[PDB]
């Protein structure tokens, strides 16, 4: 199901919902 | 004495606004091409008026 | 829709069978006026 030769976001992009960690996968707090 | 407006001093320094040749032109009747009310209603309806 | 998997990238194609009428009038010698329309998928509305 590769998306090569693929556009780059063929899909409606929805709200970054302003929460706390639906923002990325990373490290963090003190 | 038949082509000169009776003056009070030859070469008067400020010809007033009455004894100088004002030019009145006929009023400029313009045919406003379009009625905006109907055009806006039609364009709102979905039409896409385009042309002369 | 469904589709048999084709490894070569492919894109759909859909039509909505919409009236595309047009009316063309000429009021004066050398002037042409047109009205475009698309009843279910109008090409222009109150926002333009």
Curated annotation (Swiss-Prot), chain B:
Coiled-coil residue spans: none
Superkingdom field: Viruses
Subcellular locations according to the entry: Virion
Modification Phosphothreonine, positions: 5
Function summary: Structural component of the virion that acts as a cement protein on the capsid interior and which glue the peripentonal hexons and group-of-nine hexons together.
Protein name, as recorded: Hexon-linking protein-N
Species, as recorded: Human adenovirus F serotype 41 (HAdV-41)
Gene name in the database record: L4
UniProtKB/Swiss-Prot annotation, chain C:
Conditions for induction: Expressed in the late phase of the viral replicative cycle.
Modified residues (Phosphotyrosine): 36
Top-level taxon in the UniProt lineage: Viruses
Localization in the cell: Virion; Host nucleus
Quaternary structure and partners: Homotrimer. Interacts with the capsid vertex protein; this interaction binds the peripentonal hexons to the neighboring penton base. Interacts with the hexon-linking protein; this interaction tethers the hexons surrounding the penton to those situated in the central plate of the facet. Interacts with the hexon-interlacing protein; this interaction lashes the hexons together. Interacts with host dyneins DYNC1LI1 and DYNC1I2; this interaction might be involved in intracellular microtubule-dependent transport of incoming viral capsid.
Job of this protein: Major capsid protein that self-associates to form 240 hexon trimers, each in the shape of a hexagon, building most of the pseudo T=25 capsid. Assembled into trimeric units with the help of the chaperone shutoff protein. Transported by pre-protein VI to the nucleus where it associates with other structural proteins to form an empty capsid. Might be involved, through its interaction with host dyneins, in the intracellular microtubule-dependent transport of incoming viral capsid to the nucleus.
Family: Belongs to the adenoviridae hexon protein family.
Miscellaneous comment as given in the Swiss-Prot or TrEMBL entry: All late proteins expressed from the major late promoter are produced by alternative splicing and alternative polyadenylation of the same gene giving rise to non-overlapping ORFs. A leader sequence is present in the N-terminus of all these mRNAs and is recognized by the viral shutoff protein to provide expression although conventional translation via ribosome scanning from the cap has been shut off in the host cell.
Protein name: Hexon protein
Organism encoding this protein: Human adenovirus F serotype 41 (HAdV-41)
Parent-record interval covered: 878 to 925 of 925
């Amino acid at each position: 199901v590769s998306f090569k030769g693929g556009v780059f976001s063929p899909y409606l992009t929805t709200r970054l919902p302003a929460w706390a960690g639906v923002r990325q996968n990373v490290m963090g707090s003190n | 004495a038949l082509t000169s407006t009776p003056r009070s001093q030859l070469n008067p320094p400020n010809w007033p606004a009455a004894q100088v040749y004002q030019e009145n032109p006929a009023p400029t009747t313009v045919l406003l091409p379009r009625d905006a009310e109907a055009e806006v209603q039609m364009t709102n309806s979905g039409a896409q008026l385009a042309g002369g | 829709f469904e589709v048999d998997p084709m490894d070569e990238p492919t894109l759909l194609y859909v039509l909505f069978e919409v009236f595309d009428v047009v009316r063309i009038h000429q009021p004066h010698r050398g002037v042409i006026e047109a009205v475009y329309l698309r009843t279910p998928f109008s090409a222009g509305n109150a926002t333009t």
